């Protein structure tokens, strides 16, 4: 059982989500072909996932990670986009699901930028658009992004195009430069914190 609580566009919560992913917004050297052509988004509803058992599962993992990283799980918050948005708040992020078309091999791929998380919520190369109207710059249709918790503990700073199946040793995530893209090889190293429910917006 998953609890969805939307969060008030009064609330702070709410603003700093927001906030957070409206100024992340950057260009795409594929001209907006994968996400779309847009500055800004139209945030229709931000919500917190409540769920027990995949809390549980996090928090086990959490403990894990820091006493193999000096009591400390170095957790960020990152963005996820994903046509397995439905699966990821019901049963959370799994690795047998991991991108093998990485440029850092098989695993589960959180970006520092929500324009990013964008290009992947209709699927890779961002599939053949809105399921409606066939369209991967829809204005209509609803789209909807994860804003997670995640566990990285000792991330290994990667800048070549190794594909990797697992994190190297005495590491627990991938970052990975040429913006930065965070790799991570079990699910239960990010938490769906918040769904983002928004529409990507034409310019004028
Ligand atoms: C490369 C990258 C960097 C930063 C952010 C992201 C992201 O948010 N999602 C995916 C992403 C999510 C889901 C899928 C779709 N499935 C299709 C079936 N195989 C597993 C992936 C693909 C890519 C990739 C990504
Ligand atoms: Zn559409």
């Given at each position: 059982?998953?609890?969805?609580?939307?969060?008030?566009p009064?609330?702070?919560?709410?603003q700093?989500?927001?906030?957070?992913?409206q100024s992340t917004?950057?260009?795409?050297?594929?001209?907006?072909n994968?996400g779309?052509?847009?500055?800004?988004y139209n945030?229709?509803?931000?919500?917190?996932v409540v769920?027990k058992?995949?809390?549980?599962?996090?928090?086990?993992r959490?403990?894990?990670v820091?006493?193999?990283?000096?009591n400390?799980?170095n957790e960020r918050?990152?963005?996820?986009?994903?046509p397995?948005?439905n699966?990821?708040?019901?049963?959370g992020?799994?690795?047998?699901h991991?991108?093998?078309g990485?440029?850092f091999?098989a695993?589960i791929?959180?970006a520092?930028?929500?324009?990013?998380?964008?290009?992947?919520?209709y699927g890779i190369?961002g599939?053949?658009?809105?399921p409606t109207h066939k369209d991967?710059?829809?204005?209509?249709c609803?789209?909807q992004?994860l804003?997670?918790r995640?566990t990285?503990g000792?991330?290994?700073?990667?800048?070549?195009?190794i594909?990797?199946?697992?994190?190297?040793?005495?590491h627990?995530?991938?970052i990975?430069?040429?913006?930065?893209e965070?790799?991570?090889?079990?699910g239960?190293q990010?938490?769906?914190?918040?769904?983002?429910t928004?529409?990507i917006?034409?310019?004028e």
């Amino acid at each position: 059982g998953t609890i969805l609580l939307d969060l008030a566009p009064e609330d702070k919560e709410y603003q700093s989500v927001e906030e957070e992913m409206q100024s992340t917004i950057r260009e795409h050297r594929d001209g907006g072909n994968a996400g779309g052509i847009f500055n800004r988004y139209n945030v229709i509803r931000i919500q917190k996932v409540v769920n027990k058992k995949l809390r549980e599962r996090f928090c086990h993992r959490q403990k894990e990670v820091s006493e193999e990283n000096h009591n400390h799980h170095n957790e960020r918050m990152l963005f996820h986009g994903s046509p397995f948005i439905n699966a990821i708040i019901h049963k959370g992020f799994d690795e047998r699901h991991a991108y093998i078309g990485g440029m850092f091999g098989a695993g589960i791929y959180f970006a520092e930028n929500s324009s990013k998380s964008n290009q992947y919520v209709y699927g890779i190369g961002g599939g053949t658009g809105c399921p409606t109207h066939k369209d991967r710059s829809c204005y209509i249709c609803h789209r909807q992004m994860l804003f997670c918790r995640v566990t990285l503990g000792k991330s290994f700073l990667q800048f070549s195009t190794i594909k990797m199946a697992h994190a190297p040793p005495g590491h627990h995530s991938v970052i990975g430069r040429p913006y930065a893209e965070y790799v991570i090889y079990r699910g239960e190293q990010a938490y769906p914190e918040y769904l983002i429910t928004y529409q990507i917006m034409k310019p004028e």
